[PDB]
Design a protein around this ligand. Structure first.
Ligand SMILES: NC(=O)c1ccc[n+]([C@@H]2O[C@H](COP(=O)([O-])OP(=O)(O)OC[C@H]3O[C@@H](n4cnc5c(N)ncnc54)[C@H](OP(=O)(O)O)[C@@H]3O)[C@@H](O)[C@H]2O)c1
Length: 253
Protein backbone atom coordinates (compact mmCIF):
# COMPACT_ATOMS: atom_id res chain seq x y z
CA UNK A 1 0.00 0.00 0.00
CA UNK A 2 2.19 2.65 -1.55
CA UNK A 3 -0.96 2.32 -3.66
CA UNK A 4 -3.27 5.34 -4.01
CA UNK A 5 -6.34 5.14 -1.81
CA UNK A 6 -9.59 3.73 -3.18
CA UNK A 7 -12.35 6.31 -2.53
CA UNK A 8 -16.00 5.18 -2.67
CA UNK A 9 -18.61 7.91 -3.11
CA UNK A 10 -22.24 7.07 -2.35
CA UNK A 11 -25.19 8.75 -3.94
CA UNK A 12 -22.90 8.94 -6.93
CA UNK A 13 -25.64 9.84 -9.38
CA UNK A 14 -27.04 12.62 -7.22
CA UNK A 15 -26.25 16.21 -8.25
CA UNK A 16 -23.34 16.72 -5.84
CA UNK A 17 -22.31 13.03 -5.79
CA UNK A 18 -21.85 12.85 -9.57
CA UNK A 19 -19.36 15.74 -9.37
CA UNK A 20 -17.36 14.04 -6.64
CA UNK A 21 -17.30 10.90 -8.73
CA UNK A 22 -16.06 12.89 -11.73
CA UNK A 23 -13.39 14.61 -9.68
CA UNK A 24 -12.21 11.31 -8.18
CA UNK A 25 -11.93 9.91 -11.76
CA UNK A 26 -9.96 12.94 -13.02
CA UNK A 27 -7.78 12.80 -9.92
CA UNK A 28 -6.18 9.50 -11.07
CA UNK A 29 -2.82 10.68 -9.77
CA UNK A 30 -4.24 10.80 -6.20
CA UNK A 31 -7.23 8.44 -5.98
CA UNK A 32 -8.87 5.34 -7.28
CA UNK A 33 -12.60 6.13 -7.77
CA UNK A 34 -15.50 3.92 -6.87
CA UNK A 35 -19.17 4.79 -6.78
CA UNK A 36 -22.46 3.54 -5.45
CA UNK A 37 -25.74 4.34 -6.98
CA UNK A 38 -29.32 3.30 -6.42
CA UNK A 39 -30.23 2.15 -9.97
CA UNK A 40 -28.92 0.90 -13.26
CA UNK A 41 -30.44 4.19 -14.44
CA UNK A 42 -28.14 6.21 -12.16
CA UNK A 43 -25.19 3.97 -13.14
CA UNK A 44 -25.54 4.86 -16.80
CA UNK A 45 -26.00 8.55 -15.99
CA UNK A 46 -22.48 8.72 -14.61
CA UNK A 47 -20.95 6.55 -17.34
CA UNK A 48 -21.62 2.86 -16.54
CA UNK A 49 -17.96 2.13 -15.71
CA UNK A 50 -17.08 -1.02 -13.84
CA UNK A 51 -16.18 0.95 -10.67
CA UNK A 52 -19.82 1.84 -10.21
CA UNK A 53 -21.96 -0.49 -8.13
CA UNK A 54 -25.77 -0.45 -7.65
CA UNK A 55 -27.30 -0.82 -4.20
CA UNK A 56 -29.71 0.56 -1.66
CA UNK A 57 -28.36 1.93 1.63
CA UNK A 58 -31.56 0.86 3.49
CA UNK A 59 -30.73 -2.79 2.77
CA UNK A 60 -27.24 -3.45 3.99
CA UNK A 61 -26.59 -6.69 2.13
CA UNK A 62 -26.98 -4.88 -1.19
CA UNK A 63 -24.26 -2.32 -0.50
CA UNK A 64 -21.69 -4.87 0.76
CA UNK A 65 -19.71 -5.45 -2.48
CA UNK A 66 -19.31 -1.68 -3.02
CA UNK A 67 -17.67 -1.34 0.37
CA UNK A 68 -15.08 -4.08 -0.15
CA UNK A 69 -11.46 -2.87 -0.08
CA UNK A 70 -12.08 0.90 0.20
CA UNK A 71 -9.66 3.26 1.99
CA UNK A 72 -12.03 6.23 2.11
CA UNK A 73 -15.76 6.95 1.83
CA UNK A 74 -17.61 10.16 0.80
CA UNK A 75 -21.29 9.86 1.88
CA UNK A 76 -23.43 11.92 -0.49
CA UNK A 77 -26.79 10.15 -0.07
CA UNK A 78 -29.96 11.91 1.06
CA UNK A 79 -33.66 11.37 1.64
CA UNK A 80 -35.51 13.29 -1.06
CA UNK A 81 -39.07 14.51 -0.57
CA UNK A 82 -41.49 14.71 -3.54
CA UNK A 83 -44.45 17.03 -4.00
CA UNK A 84 -47.66 15.40 -2.71
CA UNK A 85 -49.62 14.99 -5.99
CA UNK A 86 -52.94 16.55 -4.86
CA UNK A 87 -51.98 20.24 -5.03
CA UNK A 88 -54.27 22.93 -6.34
CA UNK A 89 -52.80 26.41 -6.03
CA UNK A 90 -55.89 28.45 -6.94
CA UNK A 91 -57.44 28.24 -3.52
CA UNK A 92 -54.52 29.17 -1.25
CA UNK A 93 -52.86 26.15 0.25
CA UNK A 94 -49.13 25.46 0.04
CA UNK A 95 -47.73 22.27 -1.45
CA UNK A 96 -47.30 19.33 0.88
CA UNK A 97 -44.31 17.12 0.45
CA UNK A 98 -43.92 13.44 1.22
CA UNK A 99 -41.33 10.67 1.39
CA UNK A 100 -42.15 7.24 0.04
CA UNK A 101 -42.60 4.66 2.82
CA UNK A 102 -39.22 3.26 3.93
CA UNK A 103 -37.62 6.31 2.23
CA UNK A 104 -37.99 8.81 5.09
CA UNK A 105 -34.96 10.60 6.59
CA UNK A 106 -34.99 8.29 9.63
CA UNK A 107 -34.46 5.34 7.31
CA UNK A 108 -32.16 6.90 4.69
CA UNK A 109 -30.24 9.72 6.45
CA UNK A 110 -29.94 8.07 9.84
CA UNK A 111 -30.17 4.24 9.35
CA UNK A 112 -28.96 4.43 5.72
CA UNK A 113 -25.89 6.39 6.80
CA UNK A 114 -25.34 4.17 9.84
CA UNK A 115 -25.34 1.23 7.36
CA UNK A 116 -22.64 2.92 5.32
CA UNK A 117 -20.42 3.96 8.19
CA UNK A 118 -20.75 0.45 9.79
CA UNK A 119 -19.72 -1.33 6.51
CA UNK A 120 -16.92 1.11 5.89
CA UNK A 121 -15.59 0.33 9.38
CA UNK A 122 -15.97 -3.48 8.74
CA UNK A 123 -13.95 -2.94 5.55
CA UNK A 124 -11.23 -0.94 7.33
CA UNK A 125 -11.84 2.49 5.74
CA UNK A 126 -9.35 5.10 6.95
CA UNK A 127 -11.44 8.32 6.57
CA UNK A 128 -15.15 8.92 6.11
CA UNK A 129 -16.41 12.27 4.70
CA UNK A 130 -20.15 13.12 4.92
CA UNK A 131 -22.17 15.96 3.34
CA UNK A 132 -25.19 17.36 5.26
CA UNK A 133 -26.81 20.75 5.73
CA UNK A 134 -26.66 23.89 7.89
CA UNK A 135 -29.65 24.37 10.24
CA UNK A 136 -28.95 21.50 12.51
CA UNK A 137 -28.42 23.70 15.59
CA UNK A 138 -32.16 24.48 15.61
CA UNK A 139 -34.56 21.53 15.94
CA UNK A 140 -37.38 23.93 15.07
CA UNK A 141 -35.92 24.62 11.63
CA UNK A 142 -38.75 24.69 8.96
CA UNK A 143 -36.96 21.95 6.95
CA UNK A 144 -37.73 19.36 9.64
CA UNK A 145 -41.44 19.79 8.84
CA UNK A 146 -40.88 18.94 5.15
CA UNK A 147 -42.88 15.69 4.73
CA UNK A 148 -42.90 15.41 8.53
CA UNK A 149 -39.50 13.88 8.04
CA UNK A 150 -37.30 15.77 10.53
CA UNK A 151 -34.52 15.55 7.91
CA UNK A 152 -31.98 17.78 9.71
CA UNK A 153 -32.44 15.96 13.00
CA UNK A 154 -31.84 12.50 11.51
CA UNK A 155 -28.89 13.75 9.50
CA UNK A 156 -27.28 15.27 12.57
CA UNK A 157 -27.89 11.96 14.40
CA UNK A 158 -25.74 10.26 11.72
CA UNK A 159 -23.11 13.01 11.97
CA UNK A 160 -22.95 12.44 15.77
CA UNK A 161 -22.69 8.68 15.27
CA UNK A 162 -19.86 9.25 12.76
CA UNK A 163 -18.04 11.58 15.13
CA UNK A 164 -18.43 9.04 17.95
CA UNK A 165 -17.44 6.12 15.68
CA UNK A 166 -13.63 6.19 16.17
CA UNK A 167 -12.94 6.47 12.41
CA UNK A 168 -11.34 9.74 11.24
CA UNK A 169 -14.12 11.85 9.71
CA UNK A 170 -15.03 15.17 8.05
CA UNK A 171 -18.60 16.51 8.38
CA UNK A 172 -19.42 19.21 5.81
CA UNK A 173 -22.70 21.03 6.51
CA UNK A 174 -23.44 22.77 3.29
CA UNK A 175 -25.37 26.00 2.91
CA UNK A 176 -28.17 26.21 0.31
CA UNK A 177 -26.88 24.45 -2.82
CA UNK A 178 -26.38 26.21 -6.15
CA UNK A 179 -26.25 24.87 -9.67
CA UNK A 180 -23.45 27.31 -10.53
CA UNK A 181 -19.79 27.18 -11.49
CA UNK A 182 -17.28 25.73 -9.04
CA UNK A 183 -13.73 26.83 -8.12
CA UNK A 184 -14.58 30.48 -8.77
CA UNK A 185 -15.53 31.64 -5.24
CA UNK A 186 -13.92 32.28 -2.00
CA UNK A 187 -15.23 29.51 0.25
CA UNK A 188 -16.20 30.10 3.83
CA UNK A 189 -16.07 27.77 6.80
CA UNK A 190 -18.38 28.28 9.77
CA UNK A 191 -19.41 26.73 13.04
CA UNK A 192 -22.85 26.01 14.43
CA UNK A 193 -24.84 27.86 11.72
CA UNK A 194 -23.05 31.24 12.13
CA UNK A 195 -23.15 31.82 8.35
CA UNK A 196 -26.99 31.84 8.47
CA UNK A 197 -26.56 35.34 10.01
CA UNK A 198 -24.54 36.40 6.92
CA UNK A 199 -25.21 36.88 3.17
CA UNK A 200 -22.63 34.21 2.35
CA UNK A 201 -24.62 31.08 3.22
CA UNK A 202 -25.05 29.29 -0.13
CA UNK A 203 -22.50 27.28 -2.14
CA UNK A 204 -22.09 25.73 -5.60
CA UNK A 205 -22.57 21.92 -5.67
CA UNK A 206 -19.21 21.83 -7.50
CA UNK A 207 -17.47 23.62 -4.60
CA UNK A 208 -19.04 21.14 -2.10
CA UNK A 209 -17.66 18.33 -4.37
CA UNK A 210 -14.15 19.97 -4.33
CA UNK A 211 -14.11 20.47 -0.55
CA UNK A 212 -14.91 16.69 -0.27
CA UNK A 213 -11.82 15.90 -2.48
CA UNK A 214 -9.48 18.22 -0.55
CA UNK A 215 -10.69 16.75 2.79
CA UNK A 216 -9.06 13.51 1.54
CA UNK A 217 -5.65 15.17 1.09
CA UNK A 218 -5.08 17.03 4.35
CA UNK A 219 -4.65 15.57 7.83
CA UNK A 220 -6.16 18.93 8.93
CA UNK A 221 -9.58 17.84 7.55
CA UNK A 222 -9.78 14.76 9.79
CA UNK A 223 -11.96 14.74 12.95
CA UNK A 224 -13.52 18.02 11.82
CA UNK A 225 -17.11 19.25 11.58
CA UNK A 226 -17.84 22.59 9.85
CA UNK A 227 -20.38 24.55 7.77
CA UNK A 228 -19.65 25.53 4.16
CA UNK A 229 -20.77 28.75 2.50
CA UNK A 230 -19.29 30.98 -0.25
CA UNK A 231 -19.02 34.55 -1.47
CA UNK A 232 -20.52 35.24 -4.95
CA UNK A 233 -18.53 34.87 -8.23
CA UNK A 234 -16.70 37.90 -9.51
CA UNK A 235 -16.59 39.42 -5.99
CA UNK A 236 -13.43 38.02 -4.45
CA UNK A 237 -10.59 35.49 -4.71
CA UNK A 238 -11.39 31.78 -5.23
CA UNK A 239 -10.01 29.48 -2.51
CA UNK A 240 -6.79 27.54 -3.34
CA UNK A 241 -4.95 26.96 0.02
CA UNK A 242 -7.03 24.13 1.56
CA UNK A 243 -4.47 23.44 4.32
CA UNK A 244 -5.21 26.97 5.61
CA UNK A 245 -8.94 26.50 5.10
CA UNK A 246 -9.03 23.34 7.16
CA UNK A 247 -6.72 24.75 9.78
CA UNK A 248 -9.47 27.32 10.48
CA UNK A 249 -11.60 24.50 11.81
CA UNK A 250 -11.27 23.27 15.37
CA UNK A 251 -14.74 21.77 16.01
CA UNK A 252 -15.05 18.01 16.27
CA UNK A 253 -18.86 18.41 16.04
N1 LIG B 1 -30.51 20.99 -1.75
C1 LIG B 1 -29.92 21.84 -0.90
O1 LIG B 1 -29.92 23.23 -1.15
C2 LIG B 1 -29.25 21.30 0.33
C3 LIG B 1 -28.65 22.21 1.19
C4 LIG B 1 -27.70 21.83 2.10
C5 LIG B 1 -27.34 20.46 2.17
N2 LIG B 1 -27.93 19.56 1.33
C6 LIG B 1 -27.50 18.15 1.42
O2 LIG B 1 -26.48 18.08 0.47
C7 LIG B 1 -26.29 16.74 0.03
C8 LIG B 1 -26.21 16.74 -1.51
O3 LIG B 1 -27.40 17.34 -2.03
P1 LIG B 1 -27.72 17.06 -3.61
O4 LIG B 1 -28.99 17.80 -3.94
O5 LIG B 1 -26.59 17.36 -4.48
O6 LIG B 1 -28.09 15.49 -3.45
P2 LIG B 1 -29.20 14.76 -4.40
O7 LIG B 1 -29.17 15.32 -5.78
O8 LIG B 1 -30.57 14.73 -3.82
O9 LIG B 1 -28.67 13.21 -4.34
C9 LIG B 1 -29.04 12.38 -3.28
C10 LIG B 1 -28.68 10.96 -3.71
O10 LIG B 1 -29.12 10.10 -2.71
C11 LIG B 1 -29.48 8.90 -3.33
N3 LIG B 1 -30.29 7.99 -2.52
C12 LIG B 1 -31.50 8.26 -1.93
N4 LIG B 1 -31.90 7.14 -1.31
C13 LIG B 1 -30.97 6.14 -1.50
C14 LIG B 1 -30.91 4.80 -1.12
N5 LIG B 1 -31.97 4.21 -0.52
N6 LIG B 1 -29.80 4.04 -1.48
C15 LIG B 1 -28.78 4.59 -2.24
N7 LIG B 1 -28.87 5.93 -2.63
C16 LIG B 1 -29.94 6.68 -2.27
C17 LIG B 1 -30.25 9.35 -4.56
O11 LIG B 1 -30.28 8.36 -5.59
P3 LIG B 1 -31.22 8.61 -6.90
O12 LIG B 1 -30.37 9.37 -7.92
O13 LIG B 1 -31.57 7.24 -7.43
O14 LIG B 1 -32.48 9.37 -6.59
C18 LIG B 1 -29.42 10.55 -4.97
O15 LIG B 1 -28.45 10.23 -5.93
C19 LIG B 1 -27.54 16.01 0.56
O16 LIG B 1 -27.24 15.33 1.76
C20 LIG B 1 -28.50 17.13 0.90
O17 LIG B 1 -29.46 16.76 1.89
C21 LIG B 1 -28.89 19.94 0.40
Amino acid sequence: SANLPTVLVTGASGRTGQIVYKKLKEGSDKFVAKGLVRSAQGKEKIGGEADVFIGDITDADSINPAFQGIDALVILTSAVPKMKPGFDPTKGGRPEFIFEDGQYPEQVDWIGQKNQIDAAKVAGVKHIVVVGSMGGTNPDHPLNKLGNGNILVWKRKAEQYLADSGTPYTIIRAGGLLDKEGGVRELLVGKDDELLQTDTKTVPRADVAEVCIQALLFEEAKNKAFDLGSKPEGTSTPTKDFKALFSQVTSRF
